[PDB]
Structures are given as C-alpha cells and as structure tokens.
Amino acid sequence: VESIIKTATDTVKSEINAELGVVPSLNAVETGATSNTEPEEAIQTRTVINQHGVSETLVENFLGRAALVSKKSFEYKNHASTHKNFFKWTINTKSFVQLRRKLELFTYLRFDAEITILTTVAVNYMGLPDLTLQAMFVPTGALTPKEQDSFHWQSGSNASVFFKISDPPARMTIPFMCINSAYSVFYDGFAGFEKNGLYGINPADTIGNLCVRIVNEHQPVGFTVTVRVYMKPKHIKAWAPRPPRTMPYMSIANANYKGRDTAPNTLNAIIGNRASVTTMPHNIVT
Amino acid sequence: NFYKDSYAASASKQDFSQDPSKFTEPVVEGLKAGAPVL
Amino acid sequence: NFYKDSYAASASKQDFSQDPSKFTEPVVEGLKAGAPVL
Amino acid sequence: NFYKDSYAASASKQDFSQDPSKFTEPVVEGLKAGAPVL
Amino acid sequence: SDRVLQLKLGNSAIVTQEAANYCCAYGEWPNYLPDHEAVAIDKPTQPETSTDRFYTLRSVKWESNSTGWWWKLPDALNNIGMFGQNVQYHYLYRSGFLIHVQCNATKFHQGALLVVAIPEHQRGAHDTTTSPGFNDIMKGERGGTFNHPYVLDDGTSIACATIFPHQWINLRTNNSATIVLPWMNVAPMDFPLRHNQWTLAVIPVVPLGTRTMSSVVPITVSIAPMCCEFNGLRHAI
Amino acid sequence: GVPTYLLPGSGQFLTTDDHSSAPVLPCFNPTPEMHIPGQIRNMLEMIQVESMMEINNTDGANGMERLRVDISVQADLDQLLFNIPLDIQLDGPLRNTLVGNISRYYTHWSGSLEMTFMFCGSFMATGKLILCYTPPGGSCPTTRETAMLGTHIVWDFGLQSSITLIIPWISGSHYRMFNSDAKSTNANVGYVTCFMQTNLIVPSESSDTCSLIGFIAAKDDFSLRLMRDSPDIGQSNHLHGAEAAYQ
Amino acid sequence: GVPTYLLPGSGQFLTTDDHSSAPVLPCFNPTPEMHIPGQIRNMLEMIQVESMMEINNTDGANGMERLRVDISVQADLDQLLFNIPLDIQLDGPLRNTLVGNISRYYTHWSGSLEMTFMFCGSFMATGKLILCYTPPGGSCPTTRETAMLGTHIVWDFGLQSSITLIIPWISGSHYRMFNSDAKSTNANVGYVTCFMQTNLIVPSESSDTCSLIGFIAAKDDFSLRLMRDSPDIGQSNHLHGAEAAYQ
Amino acid sequence: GVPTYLLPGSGQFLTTDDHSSAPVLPCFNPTPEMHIPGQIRNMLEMIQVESMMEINNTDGANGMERLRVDISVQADLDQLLFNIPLDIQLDGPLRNTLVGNISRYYTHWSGSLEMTFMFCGSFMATGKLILCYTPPGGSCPTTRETAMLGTHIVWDFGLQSSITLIIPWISGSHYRMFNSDAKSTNANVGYVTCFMQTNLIVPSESSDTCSLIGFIAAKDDFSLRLMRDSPDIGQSNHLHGAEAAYQ
Ligand SMILES: CC(=O)N[C@@H]1[C@@H](O)[C@H](O[C@@H]2O[C@H](CO[C@]3(C(=O)O)C[C@H](O)[C@@H](NC(C)=O)[C@H]([C@H](O)[C@H](O)CO)O3)[C@H](O)[C@H](O)[C@H]2O)[C@@H](CO)O[C@H]1O
Fold first, then answer.
1. Where are the domains of chain A?
2. Which CATH class is domain A1-286?
3. Domain coordinates in residue numbering, chain B
4. Which stretches are annotated as coiled coil (chain A)?
5. Which of A206, A137, E236 is CA-nearest to residue G187?
6. Interior CA angle at F78 toward F73 and F82, to 5°?
7. Is the dihedral of CA A100, A106, A109, A111 positive or negative?
8. Which residues of F touch B (CB under 8 A)?
9. The domain that contains E182 carries what CATH number?
10. Ligand 1 center to F220 CA (angstroms)
11. In terms of Cα–Cα distance, which of E182, E162, E163, B22 is closest to A1?
C-alpha cells in the first residue's frame, strides 16, 4: 500500500464497457471506505502522462512556515510610579488563529521549532535607540524574573539570547522537547490526579516560558517596544488528520464555540445560503 | 549543518512516501475494482 | 546554488542555440542560392 | 578551528566514558550480587 | 460473504448477517507492547480472556429528534467486569478495542447513522469561555449526547468527520458497524482514569423515519478491549 | 581572512526561508520515536478521503439538515431535483469538505474530483437518478434533455447503496486558480445537476420523502500549488486568555 | 570575493552557543595534565551515590535530628511509622540529596530510584518493617493492608544492617517533568510508606527508641533533560566583598 | 568561525548583478514545459528579418504613404529618385525597423546590412534602377555618374520582383557607435541613393506612377554591444490605471 509518489498519477486510455457483473461506479459508503471508482471506469479517457508535482503539499512544507505566535507591546521607561521594561510569556500556539487552525488539522505532531524574534520601537522625536534585549528560556512553571534587574537574569543554566534592535531578528531552534514521542495537539483528558484540573491541557505540550527584558536602563523619555515571536516547525511527523475548525475561536484554553452572528460559519449554518437547492450561484448569464 | 546538534539542521522536504489507503480504504477485506462492494 | 529550489539559481546565460530560419525563411520549399526564387 | 591555538577550539562534548564505581563502590573487596555484604 | 460476520473474543461472540465489511482503524491491528517501545519496567499482567472480551453497554433509543450519542474509552468500561478491576488496581493500562454498534429496524424504515471512532476527541463548550468540567466529560458506561453534532461539539464539523475511522449504519443496507481500534496515544501506556484515547460517536445524519407501525428502535454498543496490559499495581482507586 | 560582500536580501527575515539555526539546548536527547497509527506525509492523502457536501445550504435548513438532500415521489416526469456549484475555491456546498478546506490553503489546483451519493431511503424504496457534470461555457442546464448531453451516470437504487459521478479534469490550462471571480475562464469548473431518470417509488408504509447524502473527494491525479492563508478563519481581537499568558 | 548574506540570528549572543573564539594569549603552553583521583565525566555518576533523605522535616526537629526517623516499641499492631513524598523535583525529604540537587538543574527525568534504610538501634534490638511504594492515582495509603498491595520489601533487622526498596520507573510517558504542580499527571510519582511488619522489640538495657537513616539514589537507568537554573540558590544583593573587587 | 572582511561594493544593489536568491515559495512545482512555435534565443535572430523602411518620411505623407516610394515615368535622363540616410542609431527611415529598434537598445554595432526593394507597379511596367551605397567621407552624391562609383546593384524589373543591395560592413574600427553626433567618424555609415538606370516605362492602361517598398535587415555577421535604455519610449506621468493598482 505504501509507495513513493512524486507526481500526480497518469491517466490510461479506456474503451467502451458493457460487462455483466462489473459495476465500478457503484459503491457502498457504509463500509467506511472512500469510492474507488477510477476515471477510466466512469468515462472513456485518453492517455495522459501527468507531470504535476506534489511536493508543495508535503507536510514538511505545509507546516514549514514561520508563523506569528506572540506579539507583545510594553512601555520602556522609568516605571517609578504593567510590564516594567520586561515581560513573561507562557509559550503556546493557540493565540493566533492562522497557525492554530493548521496545527489543529492533526491529532499528534512531532517537530523541532525554529524561533525568530522581531523587535520594533517607537518614541512616545529625537531618534530611535538601538537597545539590547535579553530573551531567556525558562522551563515549565519554572522560576521567572520579577524585575528588569533581578539576579534571575544572570541565566547560569537557562538559555538566554542577547540581541540588538539594529541586528537581524534573533533566531534559534528549540528541539522537539515533549516528554512523549509527539506533542498532543488535542488532549481528551485532565492534566491532574484530582478532579478539579483543567480539561484539554496536557502540560507536557507546553514548550515553556519566554522572559524578555530590555537590558539598557531606562532613558530620560519613554518608548513603546513591541516584540514579535515567530515559530516554524521542521523535521515534522504528523498523525491522524482532523476536521478543520469552522467556528471562530473563543479561547486559547479550549475548543469552545459560538459561531458568527450570521452565515457563513454560524453554528446553525457553516456555508452561506443560496435561494434553493436548484438555484445556481454565479450562474453564467450569456 | 555546521551545528553539533542534528535537530538544528534545515528542513527535510524529501519524504515522498504515501499510503492514502490507511484513510481511504481502512477495510479489512480489500475491495476489487468493478466487483459489487457488498 | 545553495537553495533547495532550482528556480532560485542565478541566471542561465549559456544557451547559444539559434535557428533564424524559422523567422527569416519559413517557406515550405527551401530557396537555393543564386537560383530564381520564382 | 581556524585559530592556531588549540585551546581556542569549540567545546568537546564527546567524552562518554564513565566509572561510577569510584564513587558508588570504592570498597577494596568487590561486593557480589545477592551475597550477604558482611 | 462480506455481509455476514462473527466476532469471537474470550467467552463472548457476536454475529451479524447484515454487515458492511469492517474497519481496521488506519489499517492497523491491536498488539502487545514490544520491548523496544516499553517504558515502565515492572512485569505487566496480561489477563487475556478475562478482559479481552465483549462488554455490552446499556442501549439508547433512536428517536425522530435525536442528536447523537458518544462513549469515551476507556472511561465507559472503567467500572465493568475484570477490565474495570484491572483498571482500578493499576496505575497504567494499554489496549486496543473492537467496537460493534448494533441497530436493526424494518425494510420500511429509513435512517443513517455515522459511526465514527475519534482519537483525542477534546470537547468544547457552547457559548462560554469556561472549559468543560469533569462531569461534562466523564459519563462512564452511560455515555453522553451531542449538543451540536453539526460541529461535533468541538467547533469543527461532522461533515469532515469521515477523516476518522468509521462506518455507517444505513437501515436499508446494514444493521451493524464494526471498527477495530489499535492503541492510539503518544505514550506506550497511560493512566486510564484521566485520559480517554478514543471516543465512539454515533450520530443520525439522516433521521429515523417510516410510515409503518411505530416501534422503539434501539442502538446498542458492544466493546471488547484487545491485548490488555496493566502496570503499576497497587490498591483500587 | 576570506574576502566577502553582502548581497541584497542580507539580514532579511523571510517566513518561508530554509536554514539551520543555533540549537537552544545543546546535547539534548529527544524522546525516542514510537510507532503511532495514522501517519500522514502529504496533504494530498487527506483530500482523497470523501466528506459530506453541504448541498442543502438554504434558509430554513438548520445544522445537519443542510448535509442531506431530500427527494420525494414526483407527480411530473424528468424532474430537476438539485444542482451543485463546483468551485472548490469559493463558498458553497463544496467549501467545508476535506478537499475544499485543504485546497483553500492553496491557489492553484488540478485533478479529477469524485462525487459519491448514498441513498438513505428505506429498502422498499426504488428509483433511478441521473447525475450530470456539465463542462463550463454556458448557463446551468435546467432540463434533463440538456444536462444529459454532458458527462453523467445513471444511478439505479439497490443493494449497492452509493453511486459515484467522476468529475474528470477537463481544463484548457494545466491548473485552475482562485481569484475571487467565479466566472473567470481559469476558475469556473462547470456544473453538476441531478434529475429523476424515472422516479422515486415507495409503498404505503415507507416514507415518501427520502434523503441522499453527497460526498466529494479528490482522486490521486490531484495537485495543489501556491500556499496562501486560508480565508476560512480569522480574528479581530485577542482570544480569551491570550493576555493571561503574560500574567 | 565570496558573495554572502546574513541570516536571522546574526550578531546575537546565545549563552548556549558553541563556537571557537580568539585566543587571548597566543602560543600559551598550559600546565601539563597530572592524574588526579576522582574524575567525574557525567553528572549521572554523581546522582548514583546514595545520600541522606531529610525525612523528619518537622517543626521541633533541628539540624541532624531531621536526618533520622525514630521508631519506638509499639503497643498496637500494624502501625504506620512514616511516609515520604516522592517528587525529587519539589521541596521535601528528597530535595537536598545528590540526586535531588542535580536533578533540579534539569526539568525532565526518567529512571529507577533506590531507597536504602540503615537501622541504627542496638544489636539486641530486633524487628521487621515493610516499606511500600504506591504508584500514583489515589490518596496516600494509611493502613498496611492497603500499602501492602503496592511494590514493597519486608525488612528483617539483622547482621546486614540495611534494606533497599527499589522505586522502579513506572510511568506512562518516557519522562516525568517538573512544572510546580505536584498533582500533575506528568509529575506525581506516587508514595512511599513504612509500617511495622511485626514490631521493634528490645531488652530492658537497650534503648527502646531507635533511629533509621534513609538514603536515596538513582540507578544507572536514569536520564535527565532540559537544563535550567536551580531554584535552590539565589541572591537579592551583591555579596559581601563583590564591589571591593573593583577597588 | 571563518574570519572574513567586507569589500567595497558590499550591500549595493546593482541592477545587472547575477546571483541566486531566496525562493519565495519552497517546494513549488512550475507548470510543465510545452513545445510552443517560434522560440527565439538570441535577439540577433529577430533583426535578421527584413522590415519596412519609412523612406517617404515627409510632410504631406500620412501613415502608410510614408512606407512606400513612388516613382514616375521620367522626361529627363539619369534622374535621382531618392536617397536614404544610413545611421540605424538615429531617427530616420531606418529607425522604426526590426534591426533599428533592437539596435537602439544597444550602443555599438558591427555587421553587414541588406536592403531589399520590391517593385509594386503593374506587370506591364518595366524599368531599370541603380541602387548605390557610398562609404563615408564626403557629401551625398546627387548625380548617377558619382553614385555609380560606389557599391551598387543595377536592378531590372521582371518576374523576380525584388532586388537586394548589400551594405557590406566597411569600417576602420571593429564597431561603430551611437553618440548623438551623426557626423562622427565612428558613427556615419555613408549614404544610399537610387537613380533611374534607364526609365520606368508603362503602357497607356497601366498606372504611370508606381511604388517601391524598401526593407532592411542585418546579415548573420552582425553584432550588438553595450545595452542601454531605448530612446524610443518614455513617460512623464503615471499611466492611466497605474494608481488604481493600489486601490
Ligand atoms: C469579495 C468578493 O469577491 N465578493 C463578495 C461576496 O462573496 C460577498 O457575499 C458573501 O461571501 C461569503 C464568502 O464566504 C467566505 C469566503 O471568503 O470564502 C467563507 C469564509 O469561511 C468566511 N470566513 C470567516 C472567518 O468567517 C468568509 C468571511 O465571512 C467573509 O470574508 C467576511 O465578509 O466568507 C459567503 O458566501 C456569504 O454567504 C456571502 O453573502 C458579498 C457580501 O456583500 O460582498 C462581495 O464583495
């Protein structure tokens, strides 16, 4: 059954059919199998040597794109009197819908994650400072800094990356780090031994915490600094495809749904309405 | 890859293996072309 | 080309093949030098 | 390492040799499995 | 030939004279945990016949306005027979499942049930940001019902649910559906009381209808664990 | 040292680039792989599975009622039962299907499609239908005499419950594309119509209104190109709990 | 020259990067190596050495009193003597041990643990104890009849002074992890309890209250992953003399 | 790492550079090639096709009247009929031709040119003409006795309707060039003049004024160098609809 496919299958010419006991166009959906009727059996076909490639749909390419997973703006200033020149982000891939929906087309996923960090600044004009930032990876529920200048930033073992706004976006790869053989995109269970735990959240699937601070002490004036984090999975293995999300997302913590106020994608009707089942939308009026 | 850890390497876009039948025909007894399914 | 997609490569300035006759002499019957054309 | 001094080289993460017994069993007379220690 | 079938496991057997072949999820078949994939080092117990047998759950009634039913595994069986006892006395379990859904009617009845085995069916709640609670998920042997089968109660769609292992019970065609499920998880074994590998969903896409004598038309589910293994023995929870 | 010079493009961050990058955790040993059922390697594998078309996408049809087409015993002959718009790249009965959803993550497509219909009436119900695929060019046919001239399959209800209408790849260009203009020569696929070949006939005790469920899928001669963001999902605000990830 | 372009990540300083760098002192000849006793090459070697568990971590127990558990001659049968929480990644009797301290520089762990107890009563004192390891799932057992159902070893005091209870690696996932939630399904290891199997029995001139010292260590099937800063040390100000290094 | 240093030119964007660059769409499979008639690989192939010279570029001559030269039955002998300026790099009868247009995308040229004239009078019309090419140096000849001393062809009207005057490459330097000075020693090609050798003679019912159509083309010993923007096209404002591409 398994084989190497590099192009769409060719078509073979077919002749007239009039054979008793042979009915290729009939099937039985009840078996759970998809129809196996071939074009050659449904109509008379010609021979076609198909050279169309199939590489753009390889899972590695389909998911292999750096997608925005985090966007955080904060004020860089004297906070004498809120993110005080730094922030902490519990990594998750459920906040931005484009990446989320694609990952959720699968049940399980195994991949390494290339992380790219983009920083921009704006004066709250005398020019834009070329600040140095520090992004420290702090494991699950592990100890995070509480001040822009706490000792925690000494990062003795935690991995930290220091980068300047004038440099290209910072980049590094976080390996597939799940305690299991693959991440659970969906988890029909409770993360704890008691009954009050959170449903659908397997801690094993949380890459960790990202603590970002501006290393420079505050300037005489304030600035707005925005940090964007992108993630690109690679060396991907995927299992058990799933029905695509139709209802708008409501929360990053669950699959709760409500639907749009009116079709399309309303709980009562996913597809937009047409006048009747005999009404052809976009009918050609020649 | 000049890095010492293999997971740091660039993407692997060379796996052209496929087996649609695990999704399209997961029936225990194979269905023959033209023959009545039931 | 260090990129994985061949279309990313630098230009290909090495095709010196030519066939002007498809534009200069697209006549079915070749015209011989010196001989009256008609 | 393109530097002339070997100490400038990148890390050496390839020494998988171990001998826990120098810490776990530094006894002069080896202890046999199952047999009474004393 | 592919319409009749007998399933026999342990001291239990089931026959159907109106089947539609049968489904082997993802073309796989259940098996015991191999040494090269094992994690827990204690010698496992493999009960065989006392656990790998058919357990029939209480039936449900297919009504003209039914929305569908679901049963989560292993939750639905965690308190039934010796499978339930092993589950309660062991921290870890592993097994496949042979599912057989039954529903007969009359040659004058019409209706179509989608019988699908969904891996990791994480339910969503409707019109609220609050995640589903323990009692919304763990129904046990009784199972639950769909609130909005149209979106599989998870914001997706039943229309594309055919991407999962399934069969249909179309009354004019067959009276039973059979699906064989292999162990499905990212770990070789798991704690049975807090995580459900599979969810059996039976949804009437085409409602039950007829103009003949009205009768109660039940839907029955029989499930047989396969290749059961348990590790981490202790007292019963 | 080595003499070098930076090229245009230097320093940029292209979201589709492909390079190695610094490992965050040196000497990290990933969890051993384990066999898991259902591995998928090419999205083309997913779109080959047939899924339900929302043919009854009409006002008054709610939820699952939209996934089935009801046919009744007719009083007249050669009756038109329903039609189906064919652009798997636009909103319509084919959009929320496996092939439709995945295809909409792309811009170009090529290949044959297959529509399978399962009759869900009672065993005592009989009938013959004709399913027609009309290549593009004109207005959708409204009579059987016209639809019958195109690609078609005459379906006889019986033990085998389902029929398959193949929509062969018939296009001038190698690929068709989406450009939001349903009437474009490089987008319009044509039409699918269904008429009674004879009639739905049932006895007194069988329901006289029966349902069909239509499914669609791509064949293995299918190909998709030019990845793009899907128009089927979007957001205006932060999702609930998103900001709490920073607290 | 060679045409090049800078990639994202260019110019950054990653604390875990691994590259060669300019030698400050060219032609420097390091002191010759000399054999030195006790070389360690993998931290796993260190955690295999058993160290004392602080089982008596209770108010009123000071210093070394916290490192020993006193047992007395009982008046009742099947008496519970003590229990021990098992998360080597959280504060408790196992935290300040060789395996606990080193493991806390990591986030993931896997492998069997071993607890050895040495009876330190007098030679004339006798007794039998039962040490039980209960895999996770429920509440800690409080009766011998319940604890006895788990993994255990019945210990008879005698010439060989110590007993070992192996806490075999029994987990669904390849690794367990720390996430500050002791009740998480990927963190909780279960429990260890100790009951009298018979009773501590001693003559008139022997002390009737004796101490046990419990030790713990990892076996060689242990593995640690994902380095992180240890929560066992921290600072709020400069250490004394730190600033004087600049004067 | 590798020690390097940036050279002058680093970071610049040269419109004629030649390097590979990041593929926007990884794994994209371009449409298969198909044979198509008329492939051209070198622009020299295009300029070898003869095209019409606008010899009658005079006030009063409109549109196509400018593409033909009318000759009439003469009353005097040895009459001058017309001349043609020869700089294929300047505005004149040769500018809007295939060779002229393409050559003007370059600055240097070398090779022989060929001028072919087709007589379009009636069959009953006869005549002999002399076409002369005068290499540069002096003023354009105005009498046949002078023009006749240069390169020439005496043309006799007959069944073969067209004559070819070869303008052989006669230059001191390997190439000639454009520099906007038509009288420069490296630009001026010389002149082409046409006189009656005998006379155009026709009977009463044939038109006594006939037209010639002159064509020009490069031979395969031609060569063009130094690409430049063509002076034949330009814009002062945005084209209509250009800004709408942003709306
Ligand atoms: C833009 C264009 O060429 N024509 C517009 C008409 O299409 C539009 O009529 C509505 O079109 C809707 C299209 O369906 C989608 C789509 O864009 O394909 C389906 C998507 O899943 C949906 N996405 C989400 C996240 O909900 C998307 C979205 O709702 C719209 O883009 C938001 O407006 O729509 C659908 O068929 C409707 O039923 C139909 O009425 C008309 C409306 O006036 O404007 C035209 O310009």
1. 1-286
2. mainly beta
3. 1-38
4. none
5. A206
6. 75
7. negative
8. 18-23, 25-28, 30, 37-38, 40-42, 44-46, 48-49, 159-160, 220
9. 2.60.120.20
10. 30
11. B22
